[PDB]
Antibody, heavy 225, light 208 residues
Framework: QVQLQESRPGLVKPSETLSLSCTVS????????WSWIRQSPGKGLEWIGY???????EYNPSLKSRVIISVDTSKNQFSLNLSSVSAADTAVYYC???????????????????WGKGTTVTVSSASTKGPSVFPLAPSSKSTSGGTAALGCLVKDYFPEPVTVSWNSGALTSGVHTFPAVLQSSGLYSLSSVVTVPSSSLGTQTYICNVNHKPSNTKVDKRVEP | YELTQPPSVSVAPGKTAIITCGGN??????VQWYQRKPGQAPVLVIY???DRPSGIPERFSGSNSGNTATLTISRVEAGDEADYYC??????????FGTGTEVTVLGQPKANPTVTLFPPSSEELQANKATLVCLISDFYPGAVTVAWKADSSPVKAGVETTTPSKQSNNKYAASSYLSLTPEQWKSHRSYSCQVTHEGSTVEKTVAL
């Protein structure tokens, strides 16, 4: 089944050009209208433009002067370049598959059925900074009736986002990853906590897997009592 | 061209939520509807005014005529809370999105926050830093305030608290952090994170 994957998230400096790509897997690029859409709170969803398989493009009039979309069918990829960015361009950027549907000789419609996962783009003159990961050890004895809360503190990174998994994705029950706080330093910190049975502290190893794609850093932190 | 939508729609569970999308002569343009939940990508729920992709429940129904298109959600449940965007895109018009209607379901039972408080790790202390971590989950009425104390005295300076964020279960989560020096941490007898929710307060304490 077709899957779309945006390029890595991170920051773009003010006045530089934002460059993104989308890789299409599981299917062909022929017949489709490969689209870019962005979202930020209060902004709702904004269509940026699309490129048809063979190279033709159509753009949002409010962005047409700053936007180029292109396609590389040889690599099953299409791309967006948005020039002269400012804070107004900070958003989650989505790639999506536009589908045309014929109704009659003089009418057809479209829809966007398959969407990418979104990539978080921050327009900022600050520097990218990888995180420092510290373990949040479970208390020596439970205070919750037989469960142990343990976690990882992901400290002092920039920009968003960070993702956290536990035991390489084998542990999902009882996992809560909290949205980041922005500190007065202008850097982010977040925490992920998992709640497990107290007895499993002797029989199971707990490892949080922290990914900070903007800094090309991953950290696997073992959390011991 | 511009599409308009009401900012929000409130409905009690089991009842019918009606979301409208206004546009001049929208009835002769193909309307799609997209559902977006917090932190997730949009999902197509209706295309060509009334058609449902595979796996969308028949509770979601679409209509379009004149200057108003409508997304009807029958037998609403908590899982339907989301932002819903209408869209026109066909042979005669480039994609336009409506401004989005947030659907909130009434009568959800209030939930008191769970509070988990962690002291500075030994690793962080040996790096000459200290952070207290106060994690707040599963509260529903929607908002909290957080206060910190050192021993018994209020501590502000060093406190940063997140906005509430919708959880999977439509409840809310938040975090509060107290940054301090290792010397501040070891000089006091205890620190406390105090979370107030609807005039009632949960307080957790940690000691060095």
């Amino acid at each position: 089944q077709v899957q779309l994957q945006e390029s890595r998230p991170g920051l773009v400096k003010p006045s530089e050009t934002l460059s993104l790509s989308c890789t299409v897997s599981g299917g062909s690029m022929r017949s489709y209208y490969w689209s870019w859409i962005r979202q930020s709170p209060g902004k709702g969803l904004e269509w940026i433009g699309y490129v048809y398989y063979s190279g033709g493009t159509e753009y949002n009039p409010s962005l047409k002067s700053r936007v180029i979309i292109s396609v590389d069918t040889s690599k099953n990829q299409f791309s967006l370049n948005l020039s002269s960015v400012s804070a107004a361009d900070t958003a989650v950027y989505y790639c999506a598959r536009g589908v045309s549907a014929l109704v009659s000789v003089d009418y057809y419609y479209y829809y966007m059925d398959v969407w990418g996962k979104g990539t978080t783009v921050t327009v900022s003159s600050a520097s990218t900074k990888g995180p420092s990961v510290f373990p949040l050890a479970p208390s020596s004895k439970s205070t919750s009736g037989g469960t142990a809360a343990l976690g990882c503190l992901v400290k002092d990174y920039f920009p968003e986002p960070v993702t956290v998994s536990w035991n390489s994705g084998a542990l999902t029950s009882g996992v809560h990853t909290f949205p980041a706080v922005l500190q007065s330093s202008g850097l982010y910190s977040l925490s992920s906590v998992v709640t497990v049975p107290s007895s499993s502290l002797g029989t199971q190893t707990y490892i949080c897997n922290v990914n900070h794609k903007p800094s090309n850093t991953k950290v696997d932190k073992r959390v011991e009592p | 061209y511009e599409l308009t939508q009401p900012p929000s729609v409130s409905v009690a569970p089991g009842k019918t939520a009606i979301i409208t999308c206004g546009g001049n002569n929208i009835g002769s343009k193909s309307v799609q509807w997209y559902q977006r939940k917090p932190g997730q990508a949009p999902v197509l729920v209706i295309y060509y005014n009334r058609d449902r992709p595979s796996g969308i429940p028949e509770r979601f129904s679409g209509s379009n005529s004149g200057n108003t298109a409508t997304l009807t959600i029958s037998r609403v449940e908590a899982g339907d809370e989301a932002d819903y965007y209408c869209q026109v895109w066909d042979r005669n018009i480039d994609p336009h999105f409506g401004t989005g209607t947030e659907v909130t379901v009434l009568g959800q039972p209030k939930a008191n926050p769970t509070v988990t408080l962690f002291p500075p790790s030994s690793e962080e202390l040996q790096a000459n830093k200290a952070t207290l971590v106060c994690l707040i989950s599963d509260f529903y009425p929607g908002a909290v305030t957080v206060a910190w104390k050192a021993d018994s005295s209020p501590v502000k300076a060093g406190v940063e608290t997140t906005t509430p964020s919708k959880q999977s279960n439509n409840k809310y989560a938040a975090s509060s952090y107290l940054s301090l020096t290792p010397e501040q941490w070891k000089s006091h007898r205890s620190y406390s994170c105090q979370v107030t929710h609807e005039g009632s307060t949960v307080e957790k304490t940690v000691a060095l």
